[PDB]
């Protein structure tokens, strides 16, 4: 549950605990993202917040262009690498974790997203689908 | 300012055909669209308004739109007929073919 | 907006079709509601209520004088 | 969020029940009684 | 003190005691209200679990994100050989 | 309520005329009518919409 | 009831497709169990004295008694339970050949998984196909019951129409739905000829 | 001819629809207000088939085609393809593509006579798009925007390149597509013009948030309205110089 | 309802079973069961494994090529559904299976 | 910010403000304490109480210091308008008194948190906490008139018309009853009284209207009179400032 996402999101297995690194998936120039918080995360004692494919998350640029460093920005995950049960009835997982930084409104920053994008993320963020050159 | 015009010109400067010796590219407007009447919400005779058809069927929250019956077929009698899609494996779509 | 607009709308019809009767009934009920708050109140709120009542009484006496 | 015991949602559900929500259970009980009478006749026949 | 961190309590106090069931066959604690106008029909049916199995079916849930789309769902098959009546047990209301 | 008989006012736009032998029944009916339409989460000064009592006269009128 | 004495009652006469039904059943047993599992209590960090898989404290200095709410370790499972709101997906019959046949799959195959249900025999009679898990394991008795109220929720009111009924053996990583499909995919075996 | 419209909540009309001169498509999800919003203008004169692409609501970016045919991603289920075929007239060819770039709507954009495609697309996809649509194919990029489909709305009357395109790139795109082109924006300045609105020879749906000058520039470049055959941009020189 | 032959052993992959690795190359690697997926994770060659069906097709056994297999192609043609064509296909499938 | 600062924190009279602050301090902070409690416990209790009261007063003052327009360095048009309306000098003096009371409450809370640590008895800490609360109340007691003036200007400043001087505009002017209000009513959807009496509009009015695919905002003004630039009310001066600061015909 988060503002700027088209439609409600169905539950899927989490695989991005806060502080997890993930490779950059767009041409913004950042080399990798370091998650620090997950918008909409369920608060609970002793429970570390975690994200999933297509979720928005704040993340610092652990590596990449220096100008993007030393600041946290919202980011939408484009890959999870953890198995999740699609409603169609087949498990799948991405080769590696990935994501893209984006504005809180959800508009894409980079001109295009590199690599395959999960169907769950493209269905949730129309701008990500417009910027995604390969859906699954 | 003598500066803003250089940037606005990129939008104001409409392109030209640049013949590239032409092949015919006349617009394809169907005649049925030309014969279609304009929709008037105030008109009592206005089209059934599938939106209104959903509103009279309990609204958007309960109406069950039927993708069937709006698609063309050789005969309407089987328009509701279910497709197998499978037969002892090797789904029927792989085997379906004319002749 | 951008003006005393609410006063203009009050001048147009004014606050309700029947704003006056309910206000008069509330002003009549206040005479009993004051005693009800004086009796039914509990905790520190009753001390502040009695203090404000004594202050209003002293002010009314000074005004009459 | 509204409580499950909240009177407003319960009254709205009670108002919704009068229509198809009750007609479906009525037709279901009728079909069940018909199937039961058919099963009884199938046993009495033999 | 206040524990410094409020948390939901573990378990469910309403299911206690968590003792073993008195019998393998759980007994019904309540039955649907008797609408006498309706035709007579059994309020319950005994059965035997057999095993869960995968199932897939197109949804008809308008307004759902998955409307008009296949959705796999588990189902619990239950062997239910037909039941045969063997008697009756009446009841009468009493203050107790 | 039992006894009271609702009837829209003749030749009087946007009005309803409750009437009944007992003051209690007609009064409770008018109270429930004015209360069921109460505005919520909106300033009363701008939203004048809502049912309101207009008269409480006898059926006779003029006797 | 007097007319029905010695008469069998088929499930079709008590239930029908898309009907919701409660399914009370005893839970699977587990024996004695620690608080970490019977109640989900968090484990102690590591190698704590006097054990780690137990609540670190039972109560305060007062009252000088252990409260019933402290969730002491005890027997787990074998508890009575009353699940509700479980729609029926398919009301089969034992006389209906190819009970797993559907308008789409329409295969000539029984719903029973190849080799039989695990720790259970092959079905040979009418069977409900209620969706979702139910309390208890295989061979447990279950008492199907009405919802007790006119719910008719849109999740319940909606019609169901199965597209395919899996029958691959649960005994292992089953792939083929029927033995003939296995013999076809594998071909003739050395024992066959 | 322009008609403001909205999806569930989004100005990206192109992500949820793929308008064409002989047919149109819309996501089956949500209420009918979107499909009825398309019916209010197009009417019954052309089919408006409800459809899904692997169940996604983003089918407009997942597919591309013209009046002569249509294409769908390899991931599409056979049921959706059979529905799209039985609903559409037989004249509209359909053919599943096997190429790695499933996002055909962004990977490809086309009109009745031309079709730009992604530079990295395999030659087999180019030959298939040619054999199906009948249009000449020419891989290109919009001033470094490799996703030509999302950044360049196109129609036989004209197109709309994204605002950052260089004037030389606009002249090259006009020399290639043989159609008028103009830099601009849609959906309140959004840089993604290809996904922000659908358009055809006689209709151009767009989001409610689009600015009036943007709607005027769209109707002018597409010549969608009478007395605006793209020649009125000179009359707009005051409105355009004032807007910026 | 789109069953897939296993990427490793070519066995059918019914819905709700198996795993589907998603490589960065963006082409699915479906696996009917955990065994084939773990074998793919080890970069084992299915052709070199005796139990793989591809090894049987490469060994010159089990009629690796036959006219009956021509019907197995994953046709992209959307040719319109027809009840008579559907019945003829339902008969032809069993006939081709018996001949095969 | 600018453009109709409706986000002001709804300032309240100093009596009600001190009452709400003392109530929040009595309710949120722990209350019960006993003579037998360790002296460090009573000291930490009174310190937490004084710190809570001081932080609440500091927040109540900072919300007003931050939510107000800050007339200076906003725009010459809005600056002259607010000066003609709220007596800019008094408007600055009021917020300066607010900041002075905030700094005084801060210094008091700090000095009493420092002095409180040395208290050797529960009665001494109690008298020190009472002295801190009374100093904060006396500082609030002198703020009554400025707080009421801020509450009045907030009720007036929050209903001022939205306007961006950089945006296109067209001022209207004329003698009273000329029909300029009727001209604004006809040229745009904005409602304005058209009563015969001379000054039907005591304040500026605005009304957007589209033209040539471009937005425009007609701005009626509250009349003008032929006076020697000194015998004039704030209304006429506010009108003259609207013309002087606004270009475009
Ligand atoms: Mg006037
Ligand atoms: Zn395999």
JSON list of N, CA and C in Angstrom, two decimals, chain H residues 74-75 78-79 81-82 85-86 88 90 94-96 98 100, chain I residues 1-2 24-28 74-81:
[
{"chain": "H", "resi": 74, "resn": "UNK", "atom": "N", "xyz": [5.76, -12.54, -26.62]},
{"chain": "H", "resi": 74, "resn": "UNK", "atom": "CA", "xyz": [5.83, -13.99, -26.57]},
{"chain": "H", "resi": 74, "resn": "UNK", "atom": "C", "xyz": [5.19, -14.55, -25.31]},
{"chain": "H", "resi": 75, "resn": "UNK", "atom": "N", "xyz": [5.18, -13.77, -24.22]},
{"chain": "H", "resi": 75, "resn": "UNK", "atom": "CA", "xyz": [4.62, -14.23, -22.96]},
{"chain": "H", "resi": 75, "resn": "UNK", "atom": "C", "xyz": [3.10, -14.29, -22.96]},
{"chain": "H", "resi": 78, "resn": "UNK", "atom": "N", "xyz": [-2.24, -18.08, -24.94]},
{"chain": "H", "resi": 78, "resn": "UNK", "atom": "CA", "xyz": [-2.96, -18.38, -26.18]},
{"chain": "H", "resi": 78, "resn": "UNK", "atom": "C", "xyz": [-4.42, -17.95, -26.12]},
{"chain": "H", "resi": 79, "resn": "UNK", "atom": "N", "xyz": [-5.01, -17.95, -24.92]},
{"chain": "H", "resi": 79, "resn": "UNK", "atom": "CA", "xyz": [-6.41, -17.56, -24.81]},
{"chain": "H", "resi": 79, "resn": "UNK", "atom": "C", "xyz": [-6.61, -16.10, -25.19]},
{"chain": "H", "resi": 81, "resn": "UNK", "atom": "N", "xyz": [-4.76, -14.39, -27.19]},
{"chain": "H", "resi": 81, "resn": "UNK", "atom": "CA", "xyz": [-4.55, -14.27, -28.63]},
{"chain": "H", "resi": 81, "resn": "UNK", "atom": "C", "xyz": [-5.78, -14.74, -29.40]},
{"chain": "H", "resi": 82, "resn": "UNK", "atom": "N", "xyz": [-6.39, -15.84, -28.98]},
{"chain": "H", "resi": 82, "resn": "UNK", "atom": "CA", "xyz": [-7.60, -16.31, -29.65]},
{"chain": "H", "resi": 82, "resn": "UNK", "atom": "C", "xyz": [-8.74, -15.32, -29.48]},
{"chain": "H", "resi": 85, "resn": "UNK", "atom": "N", "xyz": [-8.09, -12.40, -31.80]},
{"chain": "H", "resi": 85, "resn": "UNK", "atom": "CA", "xyz": [-8.31, -12.75, -33.20]},
{"chain": "H", "resi": 85, "resn": "UNK", "atom": "C", "xyz": [-9.80, -12.88, -33.51]},
{"chain": "H", "resi": 86, "resn": "UNK", "atom": "N", "xyz": [-10.54, -13.59, -32.66]},
{"chain": "H", "resi": 86, "resn": "UNK", "atom": "CA", "xyz": [-11.97, -13.77, -32.91]},
{"chain": "H", "resi": 86, "resn": "UNK", "atom": "C", "xyz": [-12.72, -12.44, -32.82]},
{"chain": "H", "resi": 88, "resn": "UNK", "atom": "N", "xyz": [-11.29, -9.23, -33.42]},
{"chain": "H", "resi": 88, "resn": "UNK", "atom": "CA", "xyz": [-10.87, -8.33, -34.48]},
{"chain": "H", "resi": 88, "resn": "UNK", "atom": "C", "xyz": [-11.25, -8.87, -35.86]},
{"chain": "H", "resi": 90, "resn": "UNK", "atom": "N", "xyz": [-10.77, -10.17, -39.64]},
{"chain": "H", "resi": 90, "resn": "UNK", "atom": "CA", "xyz": [-9.71, -11.00, -40.18]},
{"chain": "H", "resi": 90, "resn": "UNK", "atom": "C", "xyz": [-8.66, -10.18, -40.92]},
{"chain": "H", "resi": 94, "resn": "UNK", "atom": "N", "xyz": [-2.51, -10.86, -37.03]},
{"chain": "H", "resi": 94, "resn": "UNK", "atom": "CA", "xyz": [-1.94, -11.03, -35.70]},
{"chain": "H", "resi": 94, "resn": "UNK", "atom": "C", "xyz": [-0.87, -12.11, -35.76]},
{"chain": "H", "resi": 95, "resn": "UNK", "atom": "N", "xyz": [0.22, -11.90, -35.03]},
{"chain": "H", "resi": 95, "resn": "UNK", "atom": "CA", "xyz": [1.35, -12.83, -35.08]},
{"chain": "H", "resi": 95, "resn": "UNK", "atom": "C", "xyz": [2.20, -12.62, -33.83]},
{"chain": "H", "resi": 96, "resn": "UNK", "atom": "N", "xyz": [2.29, -13.66, -33.00]},
{"chain": "H", "resi": 96, "resn": "UNK", "atom": "CA", "xyz": [3.14, -13.58, -31.82]},
{"chain": "H", "resi": 96, "resn": "UNK", "atom": "C", "xyz": [4.60, -13.48, -32.23]},
{"chain": "H", "resi": 98, "resn": "UNK", "atom": "N", "xyz": [8.69, -13.80, -31.11]},
{"chain": "H", "resi": 98, "resn": "UNK", "atom": "CA", "xyz": [9.54, -14.58, -30.22]},
{"chain": "H", "resi": 98, "resn": "UNK", "atom": "C", "xyz": [10.78, -13.83, -29.76]},
{"chain": "H", "resi": 100, "resn": "UNK", "atom": "N", "xyz": [13.46, -11.21, -27.90]},
{"chain": "H", "resi": 100, "resn": "UNK", "atom": "CA", "xyz": [13.73, -11.01, -26.48]},
{"chain": "H", "resi": 100, "resn": "UNK", "atom": "C", "xyz": [12.99, -9.80, -25.92]},
{"chain": "I", "resi": 1, "resn": "UNK", "atom": "N", "xyz": [-3.92, -22.05, -19.68]},
{"chain": "I", "resi": 1, "resn": "UNK", "atom": "CA", "xyz": [-3.56, -23.50, -19.79]},
{"chain": "I", "resi": 1, "resn": "UNK", "atom": "C", "xyz": [-2.50, -23.71, -20.88]},
{"chain": "I", "resi": 2, "resn": "UNK", "atom": "N", "xyz": [-1.23, -23.42, -20.55]},
{"chain": "I", "resi": 2, "resn": "UNK", "atom": "CA", "xyz": [-0.10, -23.52, -21.49]},
{"chain": "I", "resi": 2, "resn": "UNK", "atom": "C", "xyz": [1.00, -24.34, -20.81]},
{"chain": "I", "resi": 24, "resn": "UNK", "atom": "N", "xyz": [19.20, -12.92, -16.95]},
{"chain": "I", "resi": 24, "resn": "UNK", "atom": "CA", "xyz": [19.33, -11.55, -17.45]},
{"chain": "I", "resi": 24, "resn": "UNK", "atom": "C", "xyz": [19.17, -11.48, -18.96]},
{"chain": "I", "resi": 25, "resn": "UNK", "atom": "N", "xyz": [19.42, -12.59, -19.66]},
{"chain": "I", "resi": 25, "resn": "UNK", "atom": "CA", "xyz": [19.17, -12.63, -21.10]},
{"chain": "I", "resi": 25, "resn": "UNK", "atom": "C", "xyz": [17.69, -12.51, -21.43]},
{"chain": "I", "resi": 26, "resn": "UNK", "atom": "N", "xyz": [16.81, -12.68, -20.43]},
{"chain": "I", "resi": 26, "resn": "UNK", "atom": "CA", "xyz": [15.37, -12.50, -20.60]},
{"chain": "I", "resi": 26, "resn": "UNK", "atom": "C", "xyz": [14.77, -13.61, -21.46]},
{"chain": "I", "resi": 27, "resn": "UNK", "atom": "N", "xyz": [15.15, -14.85, -21.17]},
{"chain": "I", "resi": 27, "resn": "UNK", "atom": "CA", "xyz": [14.49, -16.02, -21.72]},
{"chain": "I", "resi": 27, "resn": "UNK", "atom": "C", "xyz": [14.32, -17.04, -20.61]},
{"chain": "I", "resi": 28, "resn": "UNK", "atom": "N", "xyz": [13.09, -17.51, -20.42]},
{"chain": "I", "resi": 28, "resn": "UNK", "atom": "CA", "xyz": [12.76, -18.34, -19.27]},
{"chain": "I", "resi": 28, "resn": "UNK", "atom": "C", "xyz": [13.47, -19.70, -19.34]},
{"chain": "I", "resi": 74, "resn": "UNK", "atom": "N", "xyz": [4.77, -25.16, -31.93]},
{"chain": "I", "resi": 74, "resn": "UNK", "atom": "CA", "xyz": [4.09, -24.11, -31.18]},
{"chain": "I", "resi": 74, "resn": "UNK", "atom": "C", "xyz": [3.66, -23.03, -32.17]},
{"chain": "I", "resi": 75, "resn": "UNK", "atom": "N", "xyz": [2.55, -23.29, -32.85]},
{"chain": "I", "resi": 75, "resn": "UNK", "atom": "CA", "xyz": [2.08, -22.39, -33.89]},
{"chain": "I", "resi": 75, "resn": "UNK", "atom": "C", "xyz": [1.73, -21.03, -33.29]},
{"chain": "I", "resi": 76, "resn": "UNK", "atom": "N", "xyz": [2.18, -19.97, -33.96]},
{"chain": "I", "resi": 76, "resn": "UNK", "atom": "CA", "xyz": [1.79, -18.61, -33.61]},
{"chain": "I", "resi": 76, "resn": "UNK", "atom": "C", "xyz": [0.52, -18.16, -34.33]},
{"chain": "I", "resi": 77, "resn": "UNK", "atom": "N", "xyz": [-0.01, -18.98, -35.24]},
{"chain": "I", "resi": 77, "resn": "UNK", "atom": "CA", "xyz": [-1.17, -18.56, -36.03]},
{"chain": "I", "resi": 77, "resn": "UNK", "atom": "C", "xyz": [-2.38, -18.44, -35.11]},
{"chain": "I", "resi": 78, "resn": "UNK", "atom": "N", "xyz": [-3.12, -17.32, -35.13]},
{"chain": "I", "resi": 78, "resn": "UNK", "atom": "CA", "xyz": [-4.27, -17.18, -34.22]},
{"chain": "I", "resi": 78, "resn": "UNK", "atom": "C", "xyz": [-5.57, -17.74, -34.78]},
{"chain": "I", "resi": 79, "resn": "UNK", "atom": "N", "xyz": [-5.47, -18.59, -35.81]},
{"chain": "I", "resi": 79, "resn": "UNK", "atom": "CA", "xyz": [-6.62, -18.98, -36.63]},
{"chain": "I", "resi": 79, "resn": "UNK", "atom": "C", "xyz": [-7.87, -19.17, -35.78]},
{"chain": "I", "resi": 80, "resn": "UNK", "atom": "N", "xyz": [-8.99, -18.65, -36.27]},
{"chain": "I", "resi": 80, "resn": "UNK", "atom": "CA", "xyz": [-10.19, -18.52, -35.46]},
{"chain": "I", "resi": 80, "resn": "UNK", "atom": "C", "xyz": [-10.71, -19.88, -35.00]},
{"chain": "I", "resi": 81, "resn": "UNK", "atom": "N", "xyz": [-11.21, -19.91, -33.77]},
{"chain": "I", "resi": 81, "resn": "UNK", "atom": "CA", "xyz": [-11.81, -21.12, -33.22]},
{"chain": "I", "resi": 81, "resn": "UNK", "atom": "C", "xyz": [-13.09, -21.48, -33.96]}
]
